[PDB]
Design a protein around this ligand. Sequence first.
Ligand code: 5NU
Ligand code: CL
Ligand code: CL
Length: 228
Amino acid sequence: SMTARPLSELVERGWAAALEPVADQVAHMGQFLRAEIAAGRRYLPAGSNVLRAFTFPFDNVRVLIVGQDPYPTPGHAVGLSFSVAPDVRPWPRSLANIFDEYTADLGYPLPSNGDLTPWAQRGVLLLNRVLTVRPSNPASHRGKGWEAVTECAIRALAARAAPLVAILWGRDASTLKPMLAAGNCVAIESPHPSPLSASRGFFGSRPFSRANELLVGMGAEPIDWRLP
Ligand SMILES: O=c1[nH]cc([N+](=O)[O-])c(=O)[nH]1
Ligand SMILES: [Cl-]
Ligand SMILES: [Cl-]
């Protein structure tokens, strides 16, 4: 529980130190979620998954992907942005669009399922600007306190010696751009893959190959984006 336990016991070592400036704010978010349940509203993803992106090592992040907020359908969000459990189908629309672009950019076949854990395990941080949502209500937790947490995460990543490429999908993600100004960091921005915006510049944006070109240009290894 984020209200009950400290960062050292919720997230990976590097992340617990990175997020020290927002320790109280994370506990406050736990209190917010408690108050939602007390008031008769629910949230997604499950409590134990909310901070899941911060359970993969901070020092190993090469690429940061940032979306808006978690999937609004019960049974979709898993605490890694855009990912779904391997048994979920049909895929949510944003994910189908991401995979459409993945195939066009990289030439790989469509993935077998919507599980993006391989990316997380290879140094891609799958974040959202806001880490919870009320079921069936996109953006419902905007402005409730998560933004300070994800701002802190991004500043910390940018302050590392380690190279970073950021991919910012949509307007809320784009508000992280000022914090990404560091010599060791470069940001790709596009419209969000949702059907509401994808035709404004998500399709054709080739984020995966661009990220790899940027990594290689700062002397880092490219991501193996290939999903099974
Ligand atoms: O984890 C995510 N799932 C869904 C979306 N989206 O639909 O806006 C998003 O931005 N991030
Ligand atoms: Cl609800
Ligand atoms: Cl209500």
